[PDB]
Design a protein around this motif. Structure first.
Motif, PDB file in Angstrom:
ATOM      1  N   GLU A 184       0.834  -1.194   0.000  1.00  0.00           N
ATOM      2  CA  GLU A 184       0.000   0.000   0.000  1.00  0.00           C
ATOM      3  C   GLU A 184       0.870   1.246   0.000  1.00  0.00           C
ATOM      4  O   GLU A 184       1.849   1.337   0.746  1.00  0.00           O
ATOM      5  N   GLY A 185       0.512   2.205  -0.846  1.00  0.00           N
ATOM      6  CA  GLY A 185       1.326   3.366  -1.117  1.00  0.00           C
ATOM      7  C   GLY A 185       1.883   3.393  -2.521  1.00  0.00           C
ATOM      8  O   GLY A 185       2.250   4.468  -3.008  1.00  0.00           O
ATOM      9  N   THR A 186       1.951   2.258  -3.176  1.00  0.00           N
ATOM     10  CA  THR A 186       2.431   2.069  -4.532  1.00  0.00           C
ATOM     11  C   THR A 186       1.272   2.081  -5.519  1.00  0.00           C
ATOM     12  O   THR A 186       0.150   1.699  -5.172  1.00  0.00           O
ATOM     13  N   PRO A 187       1.512   2.511  -6.754  1.00  0.00           N
ATOM     14  CA  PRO A 187       0.427   2.660  -7.725  1.00  0.00           C
ATOM     15  C   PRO A 187       0.106   1.363  -8.456  1.00  0.00           C
ATOM     16  O   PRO A 187       0.920   0.445  -8.546  1.00  0.00           O
ATOM     17  N   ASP A 188      -1.114   1.311  -8.982  1.00  0.00           N
ATOM     18  CA  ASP A 188      -1.535   0.225  -9.851  1.00  0.00           C
ATOM     19  C   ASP A 188      -1.298   0.619 -11.309  1.00  0.00           C
ATOM     20  O   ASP A 188      -0.587   1.581 -11.604  1.00  0.00           O
ATOM     21  N   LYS A 189      -1.890  -0.135 -12.237  1.00  0.00           N
ATOM     22  CA  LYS A 189      -1.661   0.107 -13.659  1.00  0.00           C
ATOM     23  C   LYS A 189      -2.127   1.498 -14.073  1.00  0.00           C
ATOM     24  O   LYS A 189      -1.407   2.224 -14.763  1.00  0.00           O
ATOM     25  N   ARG A 190      -3.336   1.884 -13.664  1.00  0.00           N
ATOM     26  CA  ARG A 190      -3.885   3.168 -14.081  1.00  0.00           C
ATOM     27  C   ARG A 190      -3.172   4.347 -13.439  1.00  0.00           C
ATOM     28  O   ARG A 190      -3.327   5.478 -13.907  1.00  0.00           O
ATOM     29  N   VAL A 193      -1.387   9.207   0.624  1.00  0.00           N
ATOM     30  CA  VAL A 193      -0.517  10.134  -0.086  1.00  0.00           C
ATOM     31  C   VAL A 193      -0.076   9.501  -1.396  1.00  0.00           C
ATOM     32  O   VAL A 193       0.278   8.319  -1.437  1.00  0.00           O
ATOM     33  N   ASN A 243       2.409   9.764  -5.077  1.00  0.00           N
ATOM     34  CA  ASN A 243       3.854   9.800  -5.259  1.00  0.00           C
ATOM     35  C   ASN A 243       4.392  11.223  -5.315  1.00  0.00           C
ATOM     36  O   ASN A 243       5.536  11.463  -4.916  1.00  0.00           O
ATOM     37  N   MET A 292      -5.948   9.668  -8.792  1.00  0.00           N
ATOM     38  CA  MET A 292      -5.090  10.240  -9.824  1.00  0.00           C
ATOM     39  C   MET A 292      -5.764  10.217 -11.186  1.00  0.00           C
ATOM     40  O   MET A 292      -5.659  11.180 -11.957  1.00  0.00           O
TER      41      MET A 292
END
Ligand SMILES: [Zn+2]
Lengths: 1078, 139, 98
Positions: free
Chosen positions: B50-56, B111, B113, B122
């Motif tokens: 958690e804190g890291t982005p997915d594909k989109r 939060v 990136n 986003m």
């Protein structure tokens, strides 16, 4: 039955034949590791954790990648597809052999127009689909889906791509192209040939039902020259003896070689990528003898492992790596921890249970009761509560020694005396005894000062010590001393405590300074073949917060040479001196001196064996368990009482050393202690440390042999080594790849910058790195974790490093020197080749010129002559910038656009836009310029750099008009995407034709007709339209006579006929024969 | 010989005098118990993502504060410790220790990136910021 | 911006972001502004994976209210105290008994 190599018992002859293969003997695959002991009958095999219905076989819970995968098809990755088909009359239709008719099979499509495309692994048998394919349709179809998959979630069109993400999309496409050819060429069998054109030449045969359908595609020389055509005279030009097998190994296997060199259809790019992958894997090769040494050394000498085998050279056991990769993996895991106690809890708990199960020590609290028999005896009995039988705190305190740098273990807050305590209270005295006995086993660096200030708090009103400032007081709670900056000056400099004023307190302080346990260090594991992931310590060292001595069970219980026994004796002596004169216990009406002395004597002279255990056998068990752990030990040094060397902070760094950026402290620095704090139970630690024993008939050799055998039989060190390889490789490739689309101090060669893009910010770079990560995981068949911690905020990194600091400001910085990375090398190579062969991936360089051109000329708009093209040097050209503003005419005047120099100009002549101008004002510029472009004298050179294209062939003997496509493209441009540029190419014909007008509007500004392979391939010559014979430059070793068989001009032009080297290996499982030692 | 995938991607021999199988010996450490402990200790580490982005491009995880995230993870670890020990109260607590640790942060999905909160994800921010400036045909 | 209809604010905040295809007065104005003074241009990212602690942004604003809020923030920043100072104050008030 039985195998005389490893002494295992089998049942069927086929069973024996299948079993000897694990040692290397032949005859006439489900197991990962296979062990067997010598003193009993109980083999232990280990099979993968995803398989179903395991019949009593241990599992491999690791997440090992799929390194070795084989490929039996062709090595090529560029196919040739016909676009405009065509039949032609012929002179020779077939061959004849006394009664037989053999059809003429041509190696290339017999069409009017055929050009090269890029379908990765279009002809290849594989035993494991890596499933990252770059599949391209022919140019007459729309390939826009290849450039709109990464940063196009919002999009104003479905068939448009954003031109600000071309470079990111192309980089990901090249990464997938490289990551898809990571296979290993295979050694399918051959077959002779006696065709009159390929006579006595061993030809390779693909696996499957059919084998002679591929002999026309693999070998262009096999087809003779029956007819008079382009394929025919190309084959006439080609030389003959380069065909089939080149040479083969001298080590045969039955009647079959080990490797072989063969001429066949392929490409230099894929053969180079696979050769570099092969070199990388061969560099990791290991030896069963070395595995034997490694295990027999890790076992600490209680057990000797041996693994026999036969002489073989085609054995492949990739398991050897460097310490840098281990260190980088350790840094990644330390970042993964991330102040989340949920990822620390299971590790410590399971290591605790493992120690409890392999240790000889037994903890029964009945010893205290048997030795015991306000009644201080009953008081301490009720305060220790021996009836409780939960000693997880003791084992977890032991297991926390290996993880000093991430988790720090402190005594509980509830163990300290209530309200600070008073020496006038028996209950508080016993609380102090328990706390003082328990303190030295924790990893808290302020344990000595907490031990001192407990008694200092209890001594208020009876003894005083000098204070440092006017704020704090002697009655400050002992548990509030959690940092090195809190240690009292009187405690540090021992002579400040005056013996005429604080006698007992100075005695306690001197005892702390002199008899506190001394740190030591033991060496574990095999740093010669397993490397070592130690970051702040030398490669083979395991730090311990206590001294350790060689083992023997015949050593006296009361041995005050032992540190812990000496500590217990000294603490009991001081509490005795405290109770002796009753100077500190008014209000006690009856004299309890005799009772207190008797009880303290019993406590001191108890026959515990936990000190003996912790001194002798605990370190050996920790060293036997350490090299097998999933998350290897992460330690920070133990400083006994030197305050200026107490570690107080551990951080992680991403940016390079010669650069100044945002100070982005890792989350691990926010801990008040050095690591995540966990509390322990002083009562439990004291009871376990005070009542312990061995079994009455312990023979240490037998015990540790039987305890080491079943837990090395389920070791996953080798899977962990392979995963560390992949992790370091992914880190290097991510750095090398994200440095291309942003601004970073990591300079690598910047091969492609003509592809437009934007300066990506943190979020864009992070999502890009996420796509890269997911692609690598999908390719290697991983599911747990790879590069996820790096994606948490500003992934635009340069290199990893980890460092802590001491109290006095000194900091120790470690930086693993990352070696070369084969995936990043191959990606840079494929980009360097893309720089020259961009056309084959459906891309064109330069820009397009939009302008009406009507004539009966056939010049292929992807290869414009010099007349139609203009540029900045061209006189009478108007260059336009962002401030382009249109003003209508008035009363018959003409509209005018705003030049860059400032002047106004009418809608005539040659212009030069950036693409951004149109992409901004599409709906306005289109309505303003449509009629003028269509029928006026307006010509615009929209400059783009890179753009995907799409071909529309037509018949050059009929009317054509490209306006319905040009206007569609111009309408469909939008501020966020852009559809592929439509071209209108004529068709070439081997016979003369009539000529009709043609009105086309879009043409390129430089040669983009490079993917064109041949036109009218089955005719003698082309007479009208684009002419292109077969490119002999790509068939170099055939056409060029004086060329060495391995020569490749790879950076400029990729060859389509090479020398491939096919292998055939064996990958046996890890075998061992665990012998016992007398 | 086709190997499946673990995830989804883009889609006169007489009996010689030595052999026997009588099982005379039994190990004192206990082979089954040692194998059980090894199985428990062999497991890889949890993936803290958690804190890291997915594909989109949208971050993963809940929308809670950082420090409260750390506190919740701490006492959840405490509860799990108690459950493993098979008691009512854990004896080795990760929460409410004697150490003042009010500055500790634990990565959460609050939060992004860049360094801004994502109360509006986003993708939504990008979509509206791009839709703010599109244009239509005149008539 | 946090709100129901945020599409209507990217054009109010950022005047120099639109295109200038016209000779109209608004386009004549937008064609004179500089190009780099939009959005964020400075931030203080003390911690990794946490909120930036302050940012400087060009955006449609009002110098009077900006000055007022600057004064207010300065006044509040003169009153700031930290946990160590609070700890020392409470300890000295308690006189060692706390
Ligand atoms: Zn065998």
């Amino acid at each position: 039955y039985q195998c005389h190599v490893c002494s295992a018992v089998l049942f069927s002859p086929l069973d024996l034949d299948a079993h000897v293969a694990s040692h290397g003997l032949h005859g006439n695959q489900r197991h990962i590791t296979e062990f067997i002991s010598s003193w009993q009958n109980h083999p232990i095999v280990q099979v993968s954790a995803d398989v179903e219905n395991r019949k009593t076989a241990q599992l491999l819970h690791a997440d090992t990648p799929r390194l070795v995968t084989w490929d039996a098809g062709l090595c090529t990755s560029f196919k040739i597809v016909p676009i405009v088909p065509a039949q032609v009359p012929q002179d020779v239709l077939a061959y004849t052999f006394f009664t037989s008719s053999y059809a003429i099979q041509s190696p290339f499509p017999e069409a009017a127009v055929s050009r090269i495309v890029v379908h990765t692994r279009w002809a290849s048998n594989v035993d494991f689909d890596r499933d990252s394919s770059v599949i391209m349709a022919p140019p007459t179809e729309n390939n826009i889906h290849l450039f709109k998959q990464l940063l196009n979630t919002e999009t104003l069109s479905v068939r448009g791509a954003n031109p600000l993400m071309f470079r990111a999309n192309v980089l990901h496409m090249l990464l997938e192209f490289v990551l898809d050819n990571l296979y290993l060429n295979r050694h399918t069998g051959f077959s002779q040939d006696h065709t009159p054109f390929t006579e006595g030449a061993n030809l390779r045969s693909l696996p499957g039902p059919d084998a002679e359908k591929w002999y026309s595609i693999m070998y262009p020389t096999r087809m003779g020259t029956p007819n008079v055509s382009k394929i025919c005279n190309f084959v006439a030009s080609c030389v003959r003896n380069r065909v089939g097998r080149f040479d083969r190994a001298q080590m045969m296997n039955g009647a079959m070689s080990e490797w072989v060199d063969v001429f066949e259809t392929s490409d230099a790019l894929t053969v180079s990528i696979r050769g570099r992958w092969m070199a990388r894997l061969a560099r990791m090769n290991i030896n069963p003898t070395e595995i034997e040494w490694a295990l027999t050394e890790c076992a600490q000498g209680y057990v000797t492992v041996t693994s026999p085998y036969a002489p073989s050279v085609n054995r492949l056991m990739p398991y050897r790596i460097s310490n840098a990769e281990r260190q980088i993996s350790q840094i990644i895991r330390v970042m993964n921890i991330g102040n989340n106690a949920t990822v620390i809890q299971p590790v410590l708990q399971d290591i605790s249970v493992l120690l409890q199960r392999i240790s000889p020590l037994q903890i029964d609290p009945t010893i205290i009761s048997n030795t015991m028999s306000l009644s201080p005896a009953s008081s301490i009995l009720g305060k220790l509560r021996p009836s409780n039988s939960d000693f997880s705190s003791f084992r977890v305190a032991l297991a926390g020694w290996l993880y000093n740098g991430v988790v720090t273990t402190v005594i509980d807050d509830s163990s300290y005396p209530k309200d600070g305590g008073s020496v006038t209270s028996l209950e508080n005295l016993w609380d102090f005894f328990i706390l003082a006995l328990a303190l030295p086993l924790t990893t808290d660096p302020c344990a000595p000062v907490k031990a001192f200030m407990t008694l200092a708090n209890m001594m208020v009103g009876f003894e005083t010590i000098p204070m440092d400032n006017q704020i704090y007081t002697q009655s400050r709670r002992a548990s509030a001393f959690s940092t090195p900056h809190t240690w009292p000056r009187c405690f540090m400099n021992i002579q400040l405590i005056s013996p005429i004023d604080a006698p007992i307190l100075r005695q306690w302080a001197e005892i702390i300074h002199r008899y506190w346990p001394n740190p030591s260090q033991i060496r574990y594991g095999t740093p010669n073949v397993f490397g070592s992931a130690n970051l702040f310590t030398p490669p083979e060292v395991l730090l311990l917060p206590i001294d350790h001595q060689p083992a023997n069970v015949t050593t006296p219980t009361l041995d005050f040479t032992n540190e812990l026994t000496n500590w217990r004796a000294r603490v009991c002596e001081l509490m005795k001196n405290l109770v002796d004169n009753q100077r500190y216990q008014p209000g006690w009406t009856q004299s309890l001196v005799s009772s207190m002395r008797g009880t303290l004597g019993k406590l001191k002279l108890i026959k515990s064996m936990t000190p003996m255990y912790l001194q002798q056998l605990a370190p050996v068990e920790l060293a036997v368990i350490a090299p097998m752990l999933p998350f290897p030990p992460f330690q920070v040094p133990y400083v006994r009482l030197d305050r200026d060397r107490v570690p107080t902070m551990v951080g992680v760094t991403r940016q390079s050393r010669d650069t100044i950026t945002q100070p982005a402290l890792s989350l691990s620095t926010t801990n008040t202690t050095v690591g995540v704090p966990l509390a322990l139970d002083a009562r439990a630690i004291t009871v376990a440390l005070l009542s312990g024993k061995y079994p009455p008939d312990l023979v240490t050799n037998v015990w540790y042999a039987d305890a080491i055998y079943p837990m090395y039989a389920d070791t996953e060190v080798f899977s962990n080594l392979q995963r560390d390889v992949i992790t370091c490789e992914a880190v290097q490739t991510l750095v090398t790849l994200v440095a291309q689309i942003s601004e970073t101090q990591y300079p690598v060669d910047r091969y492609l910058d003509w592809i437009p893009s934007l300066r990506a910010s943190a979020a864009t770079a992070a999502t890009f790195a996420e796509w890269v990560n997911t692609s690598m995981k999908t390719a290697f068949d991983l599911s747990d974790m790879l590069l996820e911690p790096l994606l948490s905020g500003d992934p635009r990194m340069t290199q990893l490093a980890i460092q802590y600091q001491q109290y006095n400001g000194r900091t120790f910085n470690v930086i693993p020197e990352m070696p070369g990375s084969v995936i990043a090398d191959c990606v840079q190579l494929t980009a360097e080749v893309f720089n020259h062969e961009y056309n084959l991936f459906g891309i064109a360089r330069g820009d397009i010129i939009i302008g009406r051109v009507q004539s009966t000329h056939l010049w292929s708009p992807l290869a414009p002559p010099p007349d139609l093209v203009f540029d900045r040097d061209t006189p009478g050209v108007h260059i336009f910038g962002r401030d382009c503003r249109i003003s209508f005419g008035m009363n018959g005047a003409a509209p005018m656009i705003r030049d860059e120099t400032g002047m106004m100009v009418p809608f005539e002549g040659n212009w030069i836009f950036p693409l951004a101008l149109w992409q901004m004002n599409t709906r306005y510029f289109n309505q303003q310029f449509d009629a003028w472009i269509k029928t006026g004298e307006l010509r615009i050179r929209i400059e783009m750099g890179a753009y995907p294209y799409m071909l529309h062939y037509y018949d050059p003997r009929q009317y054509a008009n490209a306006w319905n496509l040009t206007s569609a493209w111009l309408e469909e441009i939008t501020p966020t995407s852009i559809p592929s540029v439509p071209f209108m190419v004529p068709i070439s014909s081997d016979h003369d034709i009539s000529s009709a007008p043609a009105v086309q509007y879009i043409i390129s500004t430089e040669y983009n007709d490079r993917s064109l392979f041949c036109t009218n391939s089955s005719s003698p010559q082309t007479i009208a339209g684009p002419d292109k014979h077969i490119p002999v430059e790509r068939y170099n070793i055939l056409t060029n006579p004086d060329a060495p068989p391995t020569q490749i001009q790879l950076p400029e032009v990729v060859d389509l006929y090479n020398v491939v080297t096919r292998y055939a290996y064996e990958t046996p499982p890890i075998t061992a024969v665990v012998m016992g030692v007398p | 010989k086709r190997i499946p995938r673990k995830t989804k991607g883009k889609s006169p021999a007489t009996a010689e005098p030595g052999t026997s199988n009588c099982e005379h010996y039994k190990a004192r450490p206990g082979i089954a118990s040692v194998q059980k402990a090894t199985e428990s200790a062999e497991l890889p580490m949890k993936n803290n993502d958690e804190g890291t982005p997915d594909k989109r491009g949208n971050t993963k995880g809940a929308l809670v504060n950082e420090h409260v995230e750390a506190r919740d993870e701490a006492d959840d670890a405490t509860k799990k410790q108690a459950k493993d020990t098979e008691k009512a109260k854990a004896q080795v607590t990760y929460s409410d220790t004697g150490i003042n640790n009010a500055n500790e942060l634990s990565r959460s999905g609050n939060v992004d990136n860049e360094g801004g909160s994502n109360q509006k994800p986003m993708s939504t921010r990008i979509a509206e910021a791009t839709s703010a400036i599109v244009s239509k045909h005149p008539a």
